[PDB]
Amino acid sequence: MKLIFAIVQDQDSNRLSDALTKGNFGATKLATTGGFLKAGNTTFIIGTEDERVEDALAIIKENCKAREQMMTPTVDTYVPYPIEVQVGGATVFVMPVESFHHFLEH
Amino acid sequence: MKLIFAIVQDQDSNRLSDALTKGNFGATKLATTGGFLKAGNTTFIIGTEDERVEDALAIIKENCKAREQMMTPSASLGVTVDTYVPYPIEVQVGGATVFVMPVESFHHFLEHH
Amino acid sequence: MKLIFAIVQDQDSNRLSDALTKGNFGATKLATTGGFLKAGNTTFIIGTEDERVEDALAIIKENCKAREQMMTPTYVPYPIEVQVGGATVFVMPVESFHHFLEH
Ligand SMILES: Nc1ncnc2c1ncn2[C@@H]1O[C@@H]2COP(=O)(O)O[C@H]3[C@@H](O)[C@H](n4cnc5c(N)ncnc54)O[C@@H]3COP(=O)(O)O[C@H]2[C@H]1O
Ligand SMILES: Nc1ncnc2c1ncn2[C@@H]1O[C@@H]2COP(=O)(O)O[C@H]3[C@@H](O)[C@H](n4cnc5c(N)ncnc54)O[C@@H]3COP(=O)(O)O[C@H]2[C@H]1O
Ligand SMILES: Nc1ncnc2c1ncn2[C@@H]1O[C@@H]2COP(=O)(O)O[C@H]3[C@@H](O)[C@H](n4cnc5c(N)ncnc54)O[C@@H]3COP(=O)(O)O[C@H]2[C@H]1O
Ligand SMILES: Nc1ncnc2c1ncn2[C@@H]1O[C@@H]2COP(=O)(O)O[C@H]3[C@@H](O)[C@H](n4cnc5c(N)ncnc54)O[C@@H]3COP(=O)(O)O[C@H]2[C@H]1O
């Protein structure tokens, strides 16, 4: 089993989430911020069997888009130039799981 | 050492945190949402020595209970002038979903000025 | 590749973020809560190449400081402290890494 951490842009979050659900993947969503832009993005945690990892990755790839994102921004004052930063569709880490439990006690 | 990621219901979050502390397990948590119900839940990150893993899992099992949760009803627009309350759709939610991950190395940095 | 989870105090978060960037490391941050003090802190997730793990750990150690924090709850008691570390750090193995760049 593997635990996938996928850091995606907020604009793709809902589409990805719906696609993972359609593909019968469980997932948990975390609100995160990037080290460089210091702005909101989204991290998904997706646990799955080894044999289904490439399927999950394909869903991520197909639902996330690389974009340019704007970064939060003399005698004479000038209007500052926007700062446009390349942001990938997804940064993904696939981690090994030692054991899984689903506790259903009442 | 292992690093446990446990996704639990909000209703159990305070009770689990208290039980971990009483059991001398460290823990960090964060508010998360579920991909299916799109509702708030909590994710715990609990680092533990190998000897203690079964004790940590026991605490999680004991303090995190399965419940039925309502699915948010359809937001589809009607014409009737009303608040419409359809049959509830109840969804099973487990006590905890838990991933135990192997740790390669551990550091606790205590530098001052 | 390895994936570092580093739990640091909020007052070190911006400095750490900047030092990682200066060191050519990527990072993601989670706003978290500690179990014992029940107070806000920051969890960094920093993925890096095997051979650079010790360099990332150095940046973390260098930029995060241990601080004393007071315990809180008919009176304000004689203060009792705990020493919050600069960082609690777990280095985790990564089976695979992907960076999807389709637009
Ligand atoms: N000097 C520099 N240092 C770092 N980034 C710079 C940069 N100059 C430009 N960039 C760009 O800034 C984008 C957003 O970085 P941010 O840290 O906010 O948001 C990141 C961060 O949240 C996460 N991420 C990327 N690398 C990571 C890593 N090694 N560990 C953990 N999270 C990472 O994925 C998000 C998107 O990363 P991506 O590389 O696609 O997109 C990056 C990168 O292309
Ligand atoms: N009873 C047992 N059951 C299963 N495995 C065992 C074990 N005793 C030793 N090991 C294995 O040997 C490693 C070194 O144990 P040690 O006791 O020298 O070094 C231990 C111990 O000195 C320390 N430690 C601190 N507080 C502890 C506590 N409450 N319980 C267990 N270990 C603790 O944490 C160190 C690292 O623990 P970690 O599990 O990463 O690494 C452990 C574990 O992989
Ligand atoms: N078609 C469907 N797809 C997904 N779930 C459906 C479903 N039909 C019913 N369910 C139920 O919805 C419950 C809540 O899922 P949610 O994704 O909001 O909240 C989840 C999610 O936050 C997390 N989780 C579950 N499996 C996951 C995985 N493989 N990876 C990451 N997080 C997971 O644990 C929470 C509770 O999960 P649990 O399985 O006990 O409980 C699930 C499951 O029993
Ligand atoms: N049972 C106990 N008795 C006496 N003193 C205790 C105690 N548990 C914690 N402390 C003290 O309280 C400080 C803050 O812990 P807290 O859980 O709020 O904040 C923690 C928590 O967010 C995280 N952390 C610590 N151990 C962890 C673990 N095993 N798993 C996950 N996160 C951990 O790192 C933060 C800083 O931990 P650090 O150890 O440097 O600093 C700790 C330690 O000085």
Author numbering:
A (entry chain B): 1 to 73, 80 to 112
B (entry chain A): 1 to 113
C (entry chain C): 1 to 73, 83 to 112
From the study:
Here, we report the crystal structures of PstA from L. monocytogenes (LmPstA) bound to c-di-AMP and in the apo form. On the basis of these observations, we conclude that PstA is related to the larger PII protein superfamily, but has diverged through evolution to specifically recognize the bacterial second messenger c-di-AMP and thus is structurally and functionally distinct from the canonical PII proteins. The structure of each LmPstA monomer is composed of a four-stranded antiparallel β-sheet packed against two α-helices on one face. In the LmPstA trimer, the β-sheet of the three monomers form the core, and the α-helices are on the periphery.
We cocrystallized LmPstA with c-di-AMP and determined the structure of the complex at 1.6 Å resolution by the molecular replacement method. Three c-di-AMP molecules are bound to symmetrically equivalent locations on the LmPstA homotrimer, located in the inter-subunit cleft between β1 and β4, and the T/B-loops of one monomer and α1, β2–β3, and β5 of a neighboring monomer. The adenine base of the first nucleotide of c-di-AMP is recognized specifically by LmPstA, through hydrogen-bonds between its N1 and N6 atoms with the main chain amide and carbonyl of Gly47 (at the end of β3), respectively. The phosphate group is hydrogen-bonded to the side chain His108 (β5) and the main chain amide of Gly94 (B-loop of neighboring molecule). In contrast the recognition of the second nucleotide of the c-di-AMP molecule is mediated by unique structural features in PstA, due primarily to the significant structural differences in the T-loop which forms a part of the inter-subunit cleft where the ligand binds. Instead, the T-loop in PstA forms a shorter, more structured loop with a conserved 34-GGFL-37 sequence in the turn. The main chain amides of Gly35, Phe36, and Leu37 have hydrogen-bonding interactions with the phosphate group of this nucleotide. The side chain of Phe36 is π-stacked against one face of the adenine, while its other face is exposed to the solvent. In comparison, the adenine base for the second nucleotide in two of the c-di-AMPs assumes a syn conformation while the third one has an anti conformation. In both conformations, the adenine base is π-stacked against the Phe36 side chain.
